[PDB]
RNA sequence: AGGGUGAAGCUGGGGUGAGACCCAGUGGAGGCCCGAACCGGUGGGGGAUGCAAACCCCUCGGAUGAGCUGGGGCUAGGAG
RNA sequence: CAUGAGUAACGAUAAAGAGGGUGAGAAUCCCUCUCGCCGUAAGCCCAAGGGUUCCUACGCAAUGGUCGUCAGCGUAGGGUUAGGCGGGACCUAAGGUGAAGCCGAAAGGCGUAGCCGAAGGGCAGCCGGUUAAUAUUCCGGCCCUUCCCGCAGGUGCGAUGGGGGGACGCUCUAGGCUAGGGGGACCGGAGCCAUGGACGAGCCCGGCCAGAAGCGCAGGGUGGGAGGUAGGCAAAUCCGCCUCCCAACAAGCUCUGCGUGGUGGGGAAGCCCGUACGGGUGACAACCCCCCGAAGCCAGGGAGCCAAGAAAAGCCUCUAAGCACAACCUGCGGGAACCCGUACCGCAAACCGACACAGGUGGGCGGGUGCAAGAGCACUCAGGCGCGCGGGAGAACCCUCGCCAAGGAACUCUGCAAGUUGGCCCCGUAACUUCGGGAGAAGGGGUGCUCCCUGGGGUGAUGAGCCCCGGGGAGCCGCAGUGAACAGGCUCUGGCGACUGUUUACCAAAAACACAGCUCUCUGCGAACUCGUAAGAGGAGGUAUAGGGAGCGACGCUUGCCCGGUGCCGGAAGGUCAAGGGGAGGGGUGCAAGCCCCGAACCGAAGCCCCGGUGAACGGCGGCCGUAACUAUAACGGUCCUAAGGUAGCGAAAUUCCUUGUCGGGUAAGUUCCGACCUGCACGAAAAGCGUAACGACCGGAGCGCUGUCUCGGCGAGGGACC
């Protein structure tokens, strides 16, 4: 029920360099699930370019686990949603209700893992930070207790632990960054399920793009009548400026934010 | 040639109705001002069927 | 409406260790290619108080996709 | 109220001519007879929307673009009725409302819940007959629907709260049934040879449609238990988790074919009569046989592929609590069932454009022949017409369309146009290439129809039952054999741009903008922005492979020189200043304690200065002078200047004014383009630079082909012009 990432199609016109991949468990969804409105409009004002659709499916799914915290699981198997960067596992509970749950590092149909007051440390069951064995991985990961699943590393294959103090364990977290969460906050265990994903590769943009959902963006578009920038002849403007009135890209954005020195250091940057 | 005529028993009827104008503050003004200061009716009446 | 194209998988036959990979059959995917209904509307032509407050003709592009379309709705006018 | 004007114009070049009729008068009404155009629509059909009108009877002074005894016109009267069609008496999404709640100077903003709110859900009938007129609404035949009263048989019955459940892409697609095509000389029937012929498997007409369920084709939708039954999906045997057996092409329970009760219809002619709307009409039928079949139906299939496809009845399943003695499941009898709806127009003179405006406007085969296929083609079936002003000769000339020869672009800014050319099958097919392809490259050749020998996929084996090519052979007639209508002109080459595209409604088919894909860079989620007076939503039930700002814009090679000024990014040591804290001190009044000012030594926020950092960040990347045996530049030869001073590729280009630059090619000649050169008036990598196949209604340069296009064209047909 893993999933080939790849295949592509082959000069069948332009559609060239498009690139597949399929989930083994194919198995369409089960009986939890809604479906979202058509948002893109707002609060009934409009906003945010892009956005167009593309079919409907629509999840709910777990983000919290403390609510059970013990009744082993087994991979009910794999499948996903219309929604997120990394699949996921339906999950079985083995008390008969199920829940659709994560899909950490390529566990295994079947397999039992749960969580909860001690859980063992295989990628899979999750735990509060605390049996953190330090400089293992998971995901998911939550600051305040209770606030839910905070950190949904997406297909964010990036929860590093990283040492702690106090009541707070530091983390390395995607961007390139060190924060910390108190301890009895918590962790799925592992690390997440996709990537190549994020390299896939897809044909005729507008095609794809727009089957993606999202339709555009057209900056300094000539007729600068709005497009912050300069526009009705060819050039570049100059001014450094950006849509809806701007500040270019590169000044910031945080403040006191009694958020930011609370916890985490690193400052913002990676250097691939 | 979409001469945006076209009415709608529907959307026309719809869209305006006596309701509808008591409804918003500016559709009931509106209203009572036609209404006495020069006769007439209401549109919102103009219905058919 | 209709027609051609002819990938991927597979099945078998072919060559190493197995394998690559080949060939053949299957297949019959989106791009699509050809071309009506559908949707656009140059290229030339025909009206100037014209069938018409934007037309008729000969013609031409897409002709499964960011396609076209009836019904039901929300955003609106220094706002959309 | 005049004026061109009694000229321009009548709404489509889909033609009409006759006879009789009725009339005060009939090109322009009625019948009937010749005749053309639709037919894939000028068909019918549902719906929308119109809302009179529809009909029947009188009438025409207004109205139709004149007519007019015609009407959709005027006057009057009559005309659509449904437990089972539809919509509500039910369900719900988006979505509006909104008891709560959060929120505004006010008016309101936001809003769960419950509600309103859909040809999206769900639900019980069909066919034959009857009116001037409406119909599955009426009549009749046939088939049911729930709800109420009862009774008869049967049960833990008994919410709508838990659950299970109805529920869902797209592409495609096996198997199985009517629709619905089609030949039956196959049976019924009213007739015929007119004309050289044939009365002969001749023509012409028809040879069904509905039918409880009973039943026979297809399939169409799965598990029995038991127990544990640490979830339950709070409350309990119903689901789901664990386990041991039976888990059978299993019995299961939901549409077709026959049924067949059985009813009903049943058409040609034909000729009798009404204007017609019509009717008798032949027994009145014969109503059987064989062929082809779908995107329809069974069906929630079945495969494959992602971009991975809605919420309320029904079956159960327990409280409430009644039930359980009168609750529910189930037969028979009895009795009930209201509200709003149809007329007709309705791809259009009744709906939308102010007009009987040739514009637009949603789904239902779309009869037939032929064509490889087909709603395109040509002629037609039914069914629909004949556009509503007429007759007339027919000269100018614009229109529409046809033919040319001699030459075949010189016309011309442009081969604008138009002609060439085009239907399938076989021979065959270039530089280049992202080896997908440019190929319908390109260039040939073919087909018609006869008779003859020869193989095939259909259908109950398979034998008058059909579709595929056969294949080949001899031969037949035309200038001619996709015989008419559907139907590529082509090749070479260059700039841009990738290619699919959207737009510019009102010139600007097309660059621009898209874009896939590059890089910078922004934000830690109560992210960052976007609207908001808070409230709040949005964002994202997403959660830095993620969500924003951006210049570019497949891909290939490749992105170098400066951050001294500008913005931005980093450090407040220091200089620097608002309010403030503030007190030295001066001050007016104070007989006086006092009351009150001004007040400024010092501390004092970002900012600003200052110091680094900093281009896929604004934005820029030079000037001059000298020297290698001689005659020509090239190397630094040091200097003036600044932040350095433009690399790689690139060049007279969608940037060279001197320019029709100079050479070269093309050419009878060419400021045109292709190639060179390169002293680049004023290219350069990121608003990209050089290049780069495929793809353009791209724009430009060749050349083969063809053609009243050009040397003038010349006659010709159809429409106005003209009487
Ligand atoms: N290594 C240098 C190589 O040669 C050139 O260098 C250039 C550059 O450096 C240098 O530029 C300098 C700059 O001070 C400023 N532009 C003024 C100065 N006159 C100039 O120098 C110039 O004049 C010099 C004295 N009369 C001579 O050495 C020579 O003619 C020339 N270099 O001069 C060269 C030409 O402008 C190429 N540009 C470079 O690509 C290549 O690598």
Same mark, same amino acid.
């Given at each position: 029920?893993?999933?080939?990432?790849?295949?592509? *199609? *082959?000069?069948?016109?332009?559609?060239?360099?498009?690139?597949?991949?399929?989930?083994?468990?194919?198995?369409? !969804?089960?009986?939890?699930?809604?479906?979202?409105?058509?948002?893109?409009?707002?609060?009934?004002?409009?906003?945010?370019?892009? /956005?167009?659709?593309?079919?409907?499916?629509?999840?709910?799914?777990?983000?919290?686990?403390?609510?059970? +915290?013990?009744?082993?699981?087994? +991979?009910?198997?794999? $499948?996903?949603?219309?929604?997120?960067?990394?699949? %996921?596992? !339906? !999950?079985?509970?083995?008390?008969?209700?199920?829940?659709? %749950?994560?899909?950490?590092?390529?566990?295994? +149909?079947?397999?039992?893992?749960?969580?909860?007051?001690?859980?063992?440390?295989?990628?899979?069951?999750?735990?509060?930070?605390?049996?953190?064995?330090?400089?293992?991985?998971?995901?998911?990961? $939550?600051?305040?207790?209770?606030?839910?699943?905070?950190?949904?590393?997406?297909?964010?294959?990036?929860?590093?632990?990283?040492?702690?103090?106090?009541?707070? +364990?530091?983390?390395?977290?995607?961007?390139?960054?060190?924060?910390?969460?108190?301890? $009895?906050?918590?962790?799925?265990?592992?690390?997440?399920?996709?990537?190549?994903?994020?390299?896939?590769?897809?044909?005729?943009? /507008?095609?794809?793009?727009?089957?993606?959902?999202?339709?555009?963006?057209?900056?300094?578009?000539?007729?600068?009548?709005?497009?912050?920038?300069?526009?009705?002849?060819?050039?570049?403007?100059?001014?450094?400026?950006?849509?809806?009135?701007?500040?270019?890209?590169?000044?910031?954005?945080?403040?006191?934010?009694?958020?930011?020195?609370?916890?985490?250091?690193?400052?913002?940057? *990676?250097?691939? | 040639?979409?001469?945006?005529?076209?009415?709608?028993?529907?959307?026309?009827?719809?869209?305006?109705?006596?309701?509808?104008?008591?409804?918003?503050?500016?559709?009931?003004?509106? !209203?009572?001002?036609?209404?006495?200061? /020069? *006769?007439?009716?209401?549109?919102?009446?103009?219905?058919?069927?």
């Amino acid at each position: 029920k893993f999933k080939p990432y790849t295949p592509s *199609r *082959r000069f069948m016109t332009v559609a060239d360099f498009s690139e597949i991949t399929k989930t083994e468990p194919e198995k369409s !969804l089960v009986k939890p699930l809604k479906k979202t409105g058509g948002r893109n409009n707002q609060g009934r004002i409009t906003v945010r370019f892009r /956005g167009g659709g593309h079919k409907r499916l629509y999840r709910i799914i777990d983000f919290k686990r403390w609510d059970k +915290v013990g009744i082993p699981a087994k +991979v009910a198997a794999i $499948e996903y949603d219309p929604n997120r960067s990394a699949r %996921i596992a !339906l !999950l079985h509970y083995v008390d008969g209700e199920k829940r659709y %749950i994560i899909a950490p590092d390529g566990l295994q +149909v079947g397999q039992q893992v749960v969580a909860g007051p001690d859980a063992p440390i295989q990628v899979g069951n999750a735990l509060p930070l605390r049996f953190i064995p330090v400089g293992t991985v998971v995901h998911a990961v $939550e600051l305040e207790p209770k606030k839910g699943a905070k950190l949904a590393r997406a297909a964010g294959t990036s929860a590093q632990i990283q040492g702690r103090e106090g009541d707070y +364990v530091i983390l390395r977290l995607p961007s390139g960054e060190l924060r910390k969460v108190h301890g $009895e906050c918590y962790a799925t265990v592992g690390a997440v399920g996709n990537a190549d994903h994020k390299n896939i590769v897809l044909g005729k943009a /507008g095609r794809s793009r727009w089957l993606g959902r999202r339709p555009h963006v057209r900056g300094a578009a000539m007729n600068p009548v709005d497009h912050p920038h300069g526009g009705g002849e060819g050039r570049a403007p100059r001014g450094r400026p950006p849509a809806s009135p701007w500040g270019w890209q590169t000044k910031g954005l945080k403040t006191r934010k009694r958020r930011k020195p609370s916890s985490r250091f690193i400052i913002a940057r *990676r250097k691939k | 040639m979409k001469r945006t005529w076209q009415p709608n028993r529907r959307k026309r009827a719809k869209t305006h109705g006596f309701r509808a104008r008591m409804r918003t503050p500016g559709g009931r003004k509106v !209203l009572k001002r036609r209404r006495q200061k /020069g *006769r007439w009716r209401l549109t919102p009446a103009v219905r058919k069927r």
